[PDB]
């Protein structure tokens, strides 16, 4: 005798980017320095491979400041420029001088 | 669950199942054009 079942299936299925690499150099043009002294904003040059999180963290670690926001753009010469606005607890002129 | 065995009835049922599968395969493969369906209507 064979003990076979009835209820069967209808279909069969088969059983190198750190804080020193992130920030290359600051921007020291007249407009950038005006923003530094007036707008409490540090203007930096960063790498092509860095995003706003990494730029914020690198600024915070390297300069020991609180970052309010980061606004990044890509320049025609293939470099990235970042405007890092710090909190009101810090004076950008002091950080630029220091 | 069925606890019973047959000698030749099982083979005949297997043959019938295979024939039905082949016939359905033929019908499905030949029904790819509507002309065959129209012809079958007057068949």
């Amino acid at each position: 005798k064979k003990a076979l079942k009835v209820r069967t299936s209808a279909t069969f299925r088969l059983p190198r980017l750190d804080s020193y690499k992130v920030i290359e150099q600051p921007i020291t043009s007249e407009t950038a320095m005006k923003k530094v002294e007036d707008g409490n904003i540090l203007v930096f040059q960063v790498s092509m491979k860095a995003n706003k999180y990494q730029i914020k963290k690198a600024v915070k670690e390297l300069y020991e400041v609180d970052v309010l926001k980061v606004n990044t753009l890509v320049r025609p010469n293939g470099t990235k420029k970042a405007y890092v606005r710090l909190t009101a607890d810090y004076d950008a002129l002091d950080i630029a001088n220091r | 669950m069925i606890k019973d065995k047959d000698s030749a009835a099982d083979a005949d049922d297997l043959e019938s199942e295979l024939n039905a599968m082949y016939s359905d395969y033929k019908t499905r493969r030949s029904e790819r054009d509507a002309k065959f369906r129209a012809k079958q209507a007057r068949g």
Partner: peptide, 19 residues
């Protein structure tokens, strides 16, 4: 429908050779 998908090709062939 197409119920043949209940048997894979190897099962169907090995049962066809039984006949």
């Amino acid at each position: 429908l197409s119920r043949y998908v209940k048997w894979p090709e190897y099962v169907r062939v090995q049962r066809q050779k039984k006949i």
